[PDB]
Design a protein around this ligand. Structure first.
Ligand SMILES: Cc1cc2nc3c(=O)[nH]c(=O)nc-3n(C[C@H](O)[C@H](O)[C@H](O)COP(=O)(O)OP(=O)(O)OC[C@H]3O[C@@H](n4cnc5c(N)ncnc54)[C@H](O)[C@@H]3O)c2cc1C
Length: 150
């Protein structure tokens, strides 16, 4: 995947404000900021790659920035971090993965609990919320994910 990163970075604060200010929230997130675990994925690049990960996300998962940037978040679904698209996961609920997938395809807010694994192989339940984000053009371009170790 040779995902390309936005020069000058991402407007994470602007998107967090946009999220808290959204008119018809389908899921209540409550106040959020950059201190929590989050990632921003580019819906317009091949396989919706992570283009930004907050430090709390890297800390929670045990992975470094170099290891998560440019990858579809699904790698967390395997203790070895090897998860091929369309593959039947052996540790994660298929309906769950399908739910995330359709929500993402439809720019629909979604919230799920998904089994994930940290870099050292430690299993945990990830309480995940994905909210589509509009960039400067006004159209949905990114998705912001909020991860919470349950
Ligand atoms: C911003 C953002 C943050 C994210 N953060 C995380 C995170 O922290 N942790 C995490 O684990 N994921 C996270 N994800 C999710 C991950 O990136 C994928 O989006 C998710 O795994 C679903 O998409 P996929 O491409 O993996 O689907 P696929 O690889 O296509 O897998 C879908 C699975 O569902 C099953 N399935 C499909 N259709 C049906 C059907 N009709 N009936 C029954 N079963 C069916 C299949 O058998 C398949 O194994 C995040 C996504 C975004 C956009």
């Amino acid at each position: 995947m040779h995902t390309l990163y936005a020069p000058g970075g991402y407007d994470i604060m602007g998107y967090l404000i946009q999220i808290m200010n959204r008119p018809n929230p389908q899921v209540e997130l409550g106040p959020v900021d950059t201190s929590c675990a989050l990632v921003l994925c580019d819906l317009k690049q091949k396989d919706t790659p992570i283009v930004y990960a907050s430090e709390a996300f890297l800390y929670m998962t045990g992975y470094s920035n170099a290891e998560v940037l440019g990858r579809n978040c699904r790698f967390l679904q395997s203790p070895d971090g090897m998860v091929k698209p369309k593959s039947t996961r052996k540790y994660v609920d298929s309906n769950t993965i399908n739910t995330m997938r359709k929500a993402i395809d439809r720019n629909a807010e979604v919230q799920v609990e998904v089994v994930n694994f940290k870099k050292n192989g430690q299993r945990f339940v990830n309480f995940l919320t994905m909210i589509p984000v509009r960039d400067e053009t006004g159209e949905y371009r990114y998705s912001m994910g909020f991860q919470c170790e349950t």
